[PDB]
């Protein structure tokens, strides 16, 4: 088995797994939409009651699996629970990350294309203070790039440059992944994360200096960090907060498991997992939280910045932020630094959500790394055509895989490891080699509190909101559902082939 060379490379690979577009694009939008500081209490709580414990459970599952030659959940679930159903439930830890990779890599490619365009100055000039005369050239710029539909038909027409940048993006992911764990992901992480950190701190400082007639950066911080105890009653905030925790810590995606399967059997995971987790939250609440929303609030005031966050997932980061930067000296280059930040943030994360399919092909079907990586990249690339051309396919995949699915899978992996395999064996396995011990109270959190909290949330989700997505959506959502159900069946088929290949020896 491959192994992480260094402790530092390990922590930074895992930190890069976690620190991604979630931190810089998703977090701000979810925080702004859900009351700012009102979002934050549930967020911090979700972190303490869901984030930390699942992080520890997945590193533990992964290291355990790795010591026996298996880094993905079809195998690892079965090693934990020797029942053929364990294998099928385990297909979600290949499918989720594959499906999420199919849209994430595309969004990551938009950051590269914008980075390119901003650096070279092929961007709009807004005229030489009507907000709409400034936002509109940027809305059009995003809209042409991805080809948002101008008519009735739910079809996208991405620009040729978008398409080619997607190819290139795929190529860069491959060039890292194909070199493997220590020479690829890990060497890359040691360069990308300090660059990410520097760029983000530069950006936070630049944002902190913005001041207009409508506000300062300080107002955005007060908005975000000022508690609204009203909203502690709204189930929507909680659902928002918990989904964000999972997305941002990469929990429920098989990705932490797979990375942890390269940790040596002996090596600490308790301190290392906490540090990765903590590096992610710093990057999210300190860096990601201090760029977009304070910039938006400085220029437009709170009400308008909230309205913008509710407008679309990408308005804030791809339209408003560069629009704002465009009104400041050297603003095109700050846009470049922002997109370049997003890109490296994306790329360190996308390699992490392709590695599970790679590990499965290597571990279970005995493909060479080269073939495993190329077939993985070919599947993602191909599938991404749906997300590039069918309007709102991105959204449907992000809902099934990236939102519901991850919460489902987190509860599942928790029940398999901490209830079926056994709480006391799970605890011992988490703690073994630990440089620190998990605090004892977390035992009761893992066994009782975390599974209750997730099961309740999932019930509320399936009742109050998923009937709307099955009933209020355009018919073309069935194109996406059909395809990704197919991907699941394809993956179940490879699990089957892998089980026959075993028997045959």
Ligand X SMILES: CC(C)C[C@H](N)C(=O)O
Ligand Y SMILES: CCCCCCCCO[C@@H]1O[C@H](CO)[C@@H](O)[C@H](O)[C@H]1O
Question: Which chain residues interact with its own copies by CB under 8 A?
Answer: 153, 155, 365-367, 371, 375, 378-379, 382-383, 385-386, 389, 475, 478-479, 482-483, 485-486, 489-490, 493, 496-497, 500-501, 504
x-or-dash string of contact with ligand Y, 112-151, rule CB under 6 A:
----x-----------------------------------
Q: Which of 18, 60, 170, 295 binds ligand MTN (CB under 6 A)?
A: 170
Instruction: State the Cα–Cα distance between residues 363 and 94, nearest whole angstrom.
Output: 13
Which of 118, 253, 427, 453 binds ligand X (CB under 6 A)? It is 253
Q: How far is the CB of 496 from Cl ion (least distance, A)?
A: 35
Single residue of 134, 283, 321, 377 touching ligand MTN by CB under 6 A: 377
What is the Cα–Cα distance from 400 to 413, expressed in whole angstroms? 17
Can you tell me which residue has the tokens 């400082």? 205
Phi, psi of 245 (to 5 degrees): -55, -50
Instruction: Give the residues across from 155 on adjacent strands.
Output: 390
Q: Which does 352 bind (CB under 5 to 8 A by kind): Cl ion, its own copies, ligand X, none?
A: ligand X
Q: Which among 321, 341, 322 is positioned nearest to 202, based on CA atoms? A: 341
Q: Is 291 in the site for ligand X (CB under 6 A)?
A: no
Identify which of residues 78 and 110 has a Cβ nearer to Cl ion in the complex: 110
CB neighbour class for 67 (10 Å; exposed up to 12, middle 13-18, buried from 19): middle
Q: How far is the CB of 113 from ligand MTN (least distance, A)?
A: 16
Assess 329 for contact with ligand Y (CB under 6 A): no
Q: Between the CA of residue 335 and those of 166, 288, 310, 441, 463, what are the distances in Å?
A: 20, 15, 22, 45, 41
Please check whether residue 259 is in contact with residue 414, taking contact to mean a CB–CB distance below 8 angstroms: no
Binding string to Cl ion for residues 153 to 192, with x set by CB under 5 A, is what?
------x-x-------------------------------
The three-class DSSP label of residue 465 is coil
164 binds ligand MTN, rule: CB under 6 A: no
Q: Name residues whose C-beta falls within 8 Å of residue 430's C-beta, 6 or more positions apart in sequence.
A: 56, 57, 59, 60, 269, 270, 438
Rounded Cα distance between 28 and 42, Å, is 15
Q: Which residues in 65-104 contact ligand X (CB under 6 A)?
A: 100
**Would you say 89 or 249 has its CB closer to Na ion?**
249
Residue 84 marked in a binding site: yes
3 phi/psi in degrees, rounded to 5: -145, 150
List the single partner that 463 binds among its own copies, Cl ion, ligand X, none, CB under 5 to 8 Å by kind. Answer: none
The DSSP letter of residue 127 is P
Least Å distance between CB 120 and its own copies?
A: 33
Using rule CB under 6 A, residue 178 touches ligand MTN: no
318 binds Cl ion (CB under 5 A): no
Q: Is 100 in the site for ligand MTN (CB under 6 A)?
A: no
- The single residue among 80, 174, 239, 308 that binds ligand MTN, judged by CB under 6 A, is 174
Rounded-to-integer distance, Cα 238 and Cα 183, Å: 40
Distances (CA, A) of 203 to 289, 290, 314, 321, 341: 11, 9, 18, 11, 9
Considering the rule CB under 6 A, would residue 104 count as an interface residue with ligand MTN?
no
Q: Does 471 bind ligand Y (CB under 6 A)?
A: yes
Q: What whole-number distance in Å separates Cα of residue 483 and Cα of residue 426?
A: 36
- Burial label for 150, CB within 10 Å (0-12, 13-18, 19+), is exposed
> CB-wise, 116 or 367, nearer to its own copies?
367
Kindly state whether residue 252 participates in binding Na ion, applying the rule CB under 5 A.
no
Under rule CB under 6 A, how many of the chain's residues touch ligand X? 15
Interface residue list for ligand MTN (CB under 6 A): 170-171, 174, 374, 377-378, 381
């Amino acid at each position: 088995r491959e192994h992480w060379a260094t402790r530092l490379g390990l922590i930074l690979a895992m930190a890069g797994n976690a620190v991604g577009l979630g931190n810089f694009l998703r977090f701000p939008v979810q925080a702004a939409e859900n009351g700012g500081g009102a979002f934050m209490i549930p967020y911090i709580i979700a972190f303490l009651l869901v984030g930390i414990p699942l992080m520890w459970i997945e590193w533990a599952m992964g290291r355990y699996g790795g010591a026996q030659g298996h880094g993905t959940t079809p195998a690892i679930f079965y090693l934990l629970w020797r029942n053929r159903f364990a294998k099928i439930l385990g297909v979600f830890g290949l499918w989720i990350p594959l499906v999420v990779a199919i849209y994430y890599v595309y969004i990551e490619s938009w950051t590269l294309g914008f980075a390119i365009k901003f650096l070279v100055g092929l961007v709009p000039e807004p005229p030489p203070t009507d907000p709409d005369s400034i936002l509109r050239p940027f809305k059009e710029f995003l809209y042409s790039y991805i080809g948002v539909p101008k008519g009735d038909e739910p079809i996208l027409k991405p620009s040729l440059f978008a398409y080619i940048v997607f190819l290139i993006t795929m190529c860069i992911n491959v060039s890292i992944l194909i070199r493997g764990i220590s020479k690829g992901i890990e060497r890359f992480a040691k360069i990308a994360m300090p660059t990410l950190f520097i760029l983000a701190v530069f950006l936070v400082i630049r944002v902190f200096l913005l001041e207009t007639p409508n506000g300062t950066a300080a107002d955005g911080l007060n908005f975000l960090w000022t508690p609204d105890f009203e909203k502690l009653k709204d189930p929507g905030v909680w659902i928002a907060a918990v989904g964000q925790i999972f997305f941002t810590l990469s929990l429920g995606f098989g990705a932490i498991i797979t990375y942890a399967s390269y940790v040596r059997k002996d090596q600490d995971i308790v301190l290392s997992g906490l540090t990765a987790a903590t590096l992610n939250e710093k990057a999210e609440v300190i860096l990601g939280g201090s760029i977009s929303i304070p910039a938006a609030v400085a220029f437009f005031g709170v009400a308008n910045a909230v309205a913008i966050a509710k407008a679309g997932a990408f308005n804030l980061g791809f339209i408003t932020l560069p629009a704002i930067f465009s009104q400041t000296a050297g603003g095109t280059f700050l846009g470049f630094l922002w997109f370049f930040l997003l890109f490296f943030a994306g790329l360190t994360s996308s390699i992490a959500i392709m590695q599970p399919m790679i590990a499965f092909l290597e571990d279970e079907l005995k493909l060479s790394r080269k073939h495993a990586v190329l077939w993985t990249a070919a599947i993602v690339f191909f599938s991404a055509h749906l997300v590039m051309f069918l309007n709102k396919s991105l959204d449907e995949m992000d809902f099934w895989a990236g939102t519901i699915g991850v919460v489902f899978f987190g509860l599942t992996e928790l029940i398999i490891f901490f209830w079926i395999f056994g709480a006391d064996k799970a605890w011992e396995e988490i703690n073994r080699g630990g440089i620190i011990k998990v605090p004892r109270i977390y035992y009761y959190v893992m066994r009782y509190i975390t599974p209750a909290f997730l099961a309740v949330l999932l019930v509320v989700w399936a009742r109050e909101y998923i009937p709307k997505i099955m009933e209020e959506t355009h018919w073309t959502v069935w194109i996406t559902r059909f395809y990704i159900i197919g991907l699941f069946l394809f993956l179940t088929f490879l699990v089957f082939l892998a089980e026959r290949r075993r028997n045959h020896e």
